[PDB]
């Protein structure tokens, strides 16, 4: 009996996730920037 | 007061008071701002052979008193001796930057010199923790820029250099609408613009200096950890405020209102500084000290630091930031008005000290850039005029939520990812 309401939950349940995990792979990498494109310059001390 | 500027083929400006010497000397609108990644140190070099022992021999049996300093926008060589023998000063000058611009430049004197800055600049590269790293400050903060560039040169570029650079540089920077003749002392301003104005000449009129590219900010950071050293010496700003700007006292106002401080002195330890409370508890430093670092196109606003609490470098910079926040949102009126009494306290003993090649450091710097001095009464006008509406407004355009720079040596493990101390840079709020 639940099927028609179930349905159309599940429609707002996946775009809302959906946004979320999208949004969030996003704000990820811009935190992650700094760590990401880091460099190393080695120089063997005397 | 003083300070009288007038320009005739060249450009005199001076500030005399009645002391015990008087010092005269040419400054060049021109610094290591100025040089490439590659000839880097061309003026540690040159500041150093107009210092050099043939050269230094000559002067000293006249009397007269050599000194040089190389900076960023400009450099300057500068020649002291006795308010009377003013002449003698001039004759000195105009004999090293036209006759014996052929000698000095001499090889064994040249390869002397040379030997000399690289024993020299290795060892503050060695040893001089806490301004090596105020210099890989501006290396990373202005990186890709003019600014960028270390006063006394790379390593590498000074052992590259040649006789070659040192002309060809000399040539396009040692010109005449690119210099200013200071004098400092005593002397008036008619005594020195008259026996300026004795010897004629020129010397490649016409030309002007080469142009470049306008230094620039960005949020990076450099990292020379080595934990062999005892200390955690660690330097942090963002983007300052240049010279002949609106702000340039509201700035340096600000830095004064946090000032600097050193753990061992009693008398420091009393200050009427909100962030002392939170870094004795645990003792978080040894020392550290506010700046306001002004330049032509760019500055510095932050602080350098010195700790042995490595295990407690987050806090150290954690509470300093968190006061830094207080400056746009909650600063208070008896924190700026203490700030201008000891702004106005520790302007006025730099302006006004017992050594002239200082005021003529001081002097040809303004002259150089804005063309003319301010007073140090039009000074105080000025900072005795700033509000906190004021104090408030420079903080929350230069240092909310804004970009920094971090630079750092020794054992600086416990110095966090640049992300968790740029975030403090700001506050929560609904």
Redesign the interface.
């Known amino acids: 009996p639940e099927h028609d309401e179930r349905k159309r939950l599940g429609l707002k349940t996946v775009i809302i996730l959906s946004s979320l995990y999208l949004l969030s792979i996003w704000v990820k990498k811009f ?1 992650w920037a ?2 990401k494109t880091r460099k190393f310059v080695f120089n063997p001390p005397k | 007061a003083e300070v009288t500027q007038l320009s005739n083929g060249i450009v005199v400006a001076t500030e005399h008071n009645p002391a015990h010497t008087a010092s005269v000397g040419v400054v060049f609108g021109s610094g290591a701002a100025n040089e490439n990644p590659y000839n880097n140190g061309v003026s540690n070099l040159w500041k150093n052979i107009f210092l050099s022992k043939e050269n230094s021999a000559v002067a000293a049996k006249e009397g007269l008193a050599l000194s040089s300093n190389i900076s960023r926008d400009f450099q300057s060589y500068i020649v002291s001796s006795l308010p009377g023998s003013t002449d003698k000063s001039l004759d000195f000058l105009n004999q090293s930057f036209i006759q014996q611009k052929a000698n000095l430049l001499s090889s064994s004197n040249f390869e002397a010199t040379k030997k000399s800055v690289l024993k020299q600049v290795q060892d503050f590269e060695d040893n001089d923790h806490p301004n090596r790293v105020l210099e890989h400050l501006h290396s990373t903060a202005f990186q890709n820029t003019p600014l960028s560039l270390p006063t006394r040169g790379t390593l590498e570029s000074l052992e590259n250099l040649v006789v070659a650079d040192l002309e060809s540089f000399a040539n396009n920077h040692f010109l005449n609408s690119n210099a200013v003749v200071v004098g400092t002392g005593n002397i008036k301003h008619e005594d020195l613009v008259n026996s300026i104005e004795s010897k004629n000449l020129s010397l490649q009129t016409g030309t002007k200096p080469v142009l470049k590219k306008k230094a620039a900010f960005l949020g990076s950071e450099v990292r020379l950890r080595d934990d062999t050293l005892p200390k955690a010496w660690i330097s942090l700003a963002v983007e300052g405020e240049p010279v002949n700007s609106p702000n340039y006292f509201v700035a340096k106002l600000a830095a004064q209102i946090f000032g600097s401080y050193n753990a061992f002195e009693p008398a420091s330890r009393l200050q009427g500084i909100k962030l002392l409370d939170n870094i004795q508890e645990y003792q978080l430093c040894d020392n550290f000290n506010h700046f306001s670092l002004s330049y032509k196109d760019s500055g510095l606003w932050g602080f350098s630091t010195a700790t042995r609490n490595v295990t407690m470098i987050d806090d150290l910079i954690h509470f300093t930031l968190k006061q830094w926040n207080r400056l746009t949102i909650s600063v208070t009126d008896t924190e700026v008005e203490r700030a201008k009494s000891l702004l106005k306290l520790q302007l006025g003993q730099l302006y006004e000290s017992g050594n002239p090649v200082n005021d003529a450091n001081l002097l040809g710097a303004e002259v150089l850039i804005k063309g003319s001095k301010l007073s140090l009464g039009e000074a105080f006008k000025k900072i005795d005029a700033i509000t906190v509406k004021d104090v408030k407004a420079w903080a929350g355009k230069r240092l909310w939520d804004q970009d920094i720079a971090i630079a750092g040596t020794g054992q600086i493990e416990g110095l966090l ?3 968790r101390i740029r975030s403090d840079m700001s506050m929560m709020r609904w």
């Open positions: 935190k700094g760590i | 990812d640049y992300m």
